[PDB]
Amino acid sequence: MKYMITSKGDEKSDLLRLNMIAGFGEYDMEYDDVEPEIVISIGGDGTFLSAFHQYEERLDEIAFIGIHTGHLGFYADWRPAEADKLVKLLAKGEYQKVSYPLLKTTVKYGIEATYLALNESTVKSSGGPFVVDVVINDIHFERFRGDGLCMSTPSGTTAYNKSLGGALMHPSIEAMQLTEMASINNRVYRTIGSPLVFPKHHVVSLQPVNDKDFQISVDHLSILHRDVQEIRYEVSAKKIHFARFRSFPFWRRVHDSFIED
Amino acid sequence: MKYMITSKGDEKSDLLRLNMIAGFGEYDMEYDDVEPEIVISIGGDGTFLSAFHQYEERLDEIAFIGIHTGHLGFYADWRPAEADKLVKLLAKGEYQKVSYPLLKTTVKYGIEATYLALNESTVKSSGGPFVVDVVINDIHFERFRGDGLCMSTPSGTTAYNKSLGGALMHPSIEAMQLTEMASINNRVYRTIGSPLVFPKHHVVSLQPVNDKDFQISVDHLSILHRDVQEIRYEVSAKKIHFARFRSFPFWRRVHDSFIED
Amino acid sequence: MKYMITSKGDEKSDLLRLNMIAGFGEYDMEYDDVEPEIVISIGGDGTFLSAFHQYEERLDEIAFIGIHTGHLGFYADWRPAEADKLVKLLAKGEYQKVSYPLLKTTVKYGIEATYLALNESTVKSSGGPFVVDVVINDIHFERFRGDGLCMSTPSGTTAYNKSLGGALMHPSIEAMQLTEMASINNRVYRTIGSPLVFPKHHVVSLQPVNDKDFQISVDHLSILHRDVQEIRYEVSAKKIHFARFRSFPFWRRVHDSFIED
Amino acid sequence: MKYMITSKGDEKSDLLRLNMIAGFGEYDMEYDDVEPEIVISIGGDGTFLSAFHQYEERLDEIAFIGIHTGHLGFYADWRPAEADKLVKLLAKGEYQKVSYPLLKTTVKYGIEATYLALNESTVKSSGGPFVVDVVINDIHFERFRGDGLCMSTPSGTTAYNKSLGGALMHPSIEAMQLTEMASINNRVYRTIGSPLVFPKHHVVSLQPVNDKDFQISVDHLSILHRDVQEIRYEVSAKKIHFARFRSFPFWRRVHDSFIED
Ligand SMILES: NCCCC(=O)NC[C@H]1O[C@@H](n2c(C#CCOC[C@H]3O[C@@H](n4cnc5c(N)ncnc54)[C@H](O)[C@@H]3O)nc3c(N)ncnc32)[C@H](O)[C@@H]1O
Numbered sequence A, B, C, D: 001m002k003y004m005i006t007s008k009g010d011e012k013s014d015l016l017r018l019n020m021i022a023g024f025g026e027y028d029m030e031y032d033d034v035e036p037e038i039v040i041s042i043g044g045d046g047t048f049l050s051a052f053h054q055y056e057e058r059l060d061e062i063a064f065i066g067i068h069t070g071h072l073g074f075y076a077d078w079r080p081a082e083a084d085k086l087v088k089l090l091a092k093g094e095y096q097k098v099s100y101p102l103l104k105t106t107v108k109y110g111i112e113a114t115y116l117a118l119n120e121s122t123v124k125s126s127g128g129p130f131v132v133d134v135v136i137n138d139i140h141f142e143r144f145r146g147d148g149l150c151m152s153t154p155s156g157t158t159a160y161n162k163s164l165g166g167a168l169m170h171p172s173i174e175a176m177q178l179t180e181m182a183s184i185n186n187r188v189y190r191t192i193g194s195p196l197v198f199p200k201h202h203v204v205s206l207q208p209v210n211d212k213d214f215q216i217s218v219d220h221l222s223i224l225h226r227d228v229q230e231i232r233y234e235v236s237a238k239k240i241h242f243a244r245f246r247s248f249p250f251w252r253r254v255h256d257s258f259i260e261d
């Protein structure tokens, strides 16, 4: 098939990429970075996120594979020593695909833009105080005051979400999880505190109270949005597809990354 | 239909029950506490849990309704002032049922018993230290040392689970959530810390390391089990069914109970 | 004595200030905003923090008093209805002073500046990733990766510190407390997690690892510092002095602000 | 001087004890377990706590030393390889003592008993629900509902207190810290949530609301108390004294135990 390989750009990753390209040259595999059907990421989870956003317009036609040249990643879960076995198995086909849910972010302005997240989307204030009204399925839920909010995909729950006290969710669950960043709670100000897990088709809307300018992040990309009227979150209808060649369960990846290896 | 009414047993609940029984007497409704098809709980969430465990062998043939005579409950979400409208609508039928997931607990002994939970099942030690091996789908995940563990249903996540730092999950998600009670973490002892959310068909097994005696709770019922070899958790194939007469969304119940009313 | 009155600037506060100024005019009290000995703050805790930083060069010669025109404050703990009794008692003297500890922040640059904090001093990164080496009394303690760090005074522990999970400390304890903002913890990255409480004369030093640019806040003031080589924290030798006219214990203020009133 | 040596009772500890006893036999050191002036603990922190409670009536006349034969302890902070250097230095004297604060627990009954804690004192319910009124210096602070409460010494803050989310406090601070175990917080029930740090002479009183029977722990000792009317906590006037032969700072012990070694 058509394939491409992205690299972290250091010496170890660039040369693994060149060696894998040489290995694919012994098969009916064409290097095409415009319309690939297999995207291999060599580096870390940051490199894998760049590869996902590089091709997020052809998610249904692409299967992703991640190789970690440093520590084990949650998306880059193949070792460099197995690049050869991977080259061959990818060329011989007969691999099954696995799909993870994604998060859709919609930003409406005053006087509309959509984004997909593989890890999470976060909202923070432009330096000053952060006050937003949280509306769930058109129902006003809370007035949040604090540092910000984070909405995570299932596979994203082991990332920022985990540091904010969120639960780890198996990626077979089509859901999104909202966590607070340093919420103020006293006699007059009140939030739920606990993380919130939302199913498919639930819409969470963040609406400004005073300042209309927010710092909005989608995975690694952080931008200042101005004249924002609403930020809408829902589980995407789209999915990211991985190529799977053997059993590496999610809970084993969790164990290997946080407990022991 | 056949119906029964359980009461908290205080003066307000007993007399609401007698008044509702009188109202049902004007319809084709027979009081039958052996094989009811409608079970009305009058009291609090504790009363509702007793009604659920009183009839957990006929869950598929029963629709539950809860009336709160004290504060608003998450299961007893009808006010006493609407008992009359409720009597009439229940008798005229034409109500839709909603279903919440349940948790199955299996306790195997040395030399097997199953339970259903509507809120959660918890495990603690018989006074001494609590050490269990946590195995997820036959994979050893962690050795837990601490006060205990709690496995919650979705509707249970606003109860003990919430106090232990777990996420609140919409009850349309068929899942279970595991939370830690005061886990020890140092150079030699290590747990994940974060709550864990498991989908249908995942099996979480707790296996003793030293002491084989544990205090096992299922909702309100707490018993000392001896010679335990394994405690198995999975989302039940069974569901509890509620009678619904108007829209009272889960996130609104969450708002009304924890934020404001 | 010489006194001055600062105001939040809204209608209620400005006119309470004018009425109190008229009341002081019936005593041997001179309005002097250059070298006052009594500083009265009318507004909220934000107004009181501005009054403290407005006169932090004469802390030993000033006793502070806060009046809250909105909700009860932890520093502005007098009601507007008692302004008259306060005018008279302040003029008749015979009040005792109470003193709270302060936090000294030192920022050293490449190729030195000091600040006092009444609530806390926080450090965040200039948008990118935040990595600092944490050194306690010249001993390398941890490499922190996350959103930032917060060092709180005792009276500051009910503010940002509380939202970050820190303990509430009685202000008679001469200490400072360090809390983490969303620290990453996995197989390769490790922090203590727990808040840390330091006694007098302990020095906590934050030293950059990669980026040398940080957003440093002292109470309400947040500035971007560039070419930073070190941020040093220690309990200040200076203290803020309050004028006390009756018993309003710290734990009662805590109760009134977070539990009920 | 007079000395004694307690042992964990395993093979490694018993024989280290016998070898140290032989080494002391070459000096003017008499083994006396009735009125020792030096108490050496060989084992873990549990062994050291037993040695402390074994001699808590002569705390002012005893200096403690802990040797860890397993992992590093916070009280047993000497390695077995340095037993010989320790034998000699203890016999030659010229060591300085360091003192850590202690926690006094008073249990009053219906129709009085005092305890000292080196780590903490905890209160839990006799199986049923735990409801106590929390009174600070005769002021009603909160009605606690949950699993229990823990009051920790400074050196105890790295133990149970840490697992409950409490702050780590340097042992030079004469204080005690109260942490909650799984408190319920909703519309009707309310606690502070945050850990609370109390100075010397502050008295925290726990008073029953319904059930008068509680499980009260002092360090490792857990007993069921009946007809309890009050549990009082305050920083003890007594102190535990350690023998110090070189610099091993508390924050380094924290680093070595929780971060890396
Ligand atoms: N030597 C670099 C040090 C800097 C570094 O923190 N780098 C990111 C770290 O995260 C891990 N990671 C990523 C990633 C990534 C790429 O950065 C962007 C993501 O930063 C996360 N992020 C941001 N601020 C965070 C915080 N305060 N705490 C925790 N994560 C935070 C967000 O979620 C972004 O989306 N995805 C997952 C995942 N799916 N599962 C578990 N681990 C994951 C990476 O292997 C790396 O260890």
Ligand SMILES: NCCCC(=O)NC[C@H]1O[C@@H](n2c(C#CCOC[C@H]3O[C@@H](n4cnc5c(N)ncnc54)[C@H](O)[C@@H]3O)nc3c(N)ncnc32)[C@H](O)[C@@H]1O
Pocket: B044, B045, B046, B049, B073, B074, B119, B120, B155, B156, B157, B158, B159, B160, B161, B163, B219, B220, D129, D145, D146, D147, D181, D182, D183, D184
């Ligand atoms: N005046 C009585 C004071 C005593 C009282 O705590 N009573 C239970 C409280 O819980 C609420 N509750 C229940 C219930 C119940 C019946 O008790 C058994 C349940 O105790 C929970 N439980 C046990 N220990 C807990 C703890 N430490 N913290 C929080 N909950 C805890 C477990 O989960 C049991 O299954 N279910 C839910 C729910 N689905 N959603 C939100 N709130 C819920 C009740 O209205 C009541 O406010």
Ligand SMILES: NCCCC(=O)NC[C@H]1O[C@@H](n2c(C#CCOC[C@H]3O[C@@H](n4cnc5c(N)ncnc54)[C@H](O)[C@@H]3O)nc3c(N)ncnc32)[C@H](O)[C@@H]1O
Pocket: A129, A145, A146, A147, A181, A182, A183, A184, C044, C045, C046, C049, C073, C074, C119, C120, C155, C156, C157, C158, C159, C160, C161, C163, C219, C220
């Ligand atoms: N309607 C305004 C909404 C905006 C507002 O959050 N305003 C500050 C709030 O705090 C209270 N406050 C202050 C203050 C202040 C003045 O702002 C600067 C302080 O913001 C704190 N701050 C910053 N980010 C925070 C966060 N994420 N969570 C909690 N606090 C946070 C820091 O600590 C600064 O130093 N000091 C204390 C105190 N000593 N004890 C208890 N409560 C305190 C104020 O009465 C007000 O409710």
Ligand SMILES: NCCCC(=O)NC[C@H]1O[C@@H](n2c(C#CCOC[C@H]3O[C@@H](n4cnc5c(N)ncnc54)[C@H](O)[C@@H]3O)nc3c(N)ncnc32)[C@H](O)[C@@H]1O
Pocket: B129, B145, B146, B147, B181, B182, B183, B184, D044, D045, D046, D049, D073, D074, D119, D120, D155, D156, D157, D158, D159, D160, D161, D163, D219, D220
């Ligand atoms: N292989 C045994 C496994 C069993 C074991 O947990 N054992 C106790 C563990 O603690 C450490 N420890 C002790 C101790 C002890 C002696 O037990 C009594 C103490 O258990 C603590 N304890 C009770 N339940 C706890 C919980 N859920 N989480 C954390 N600690 C808990 C209380 O605080 C008692 O007072 N003191 C300190 C200290 N000063 N600093 C840091 N670490 C400390 C010990 O080296 C050992 O690793």
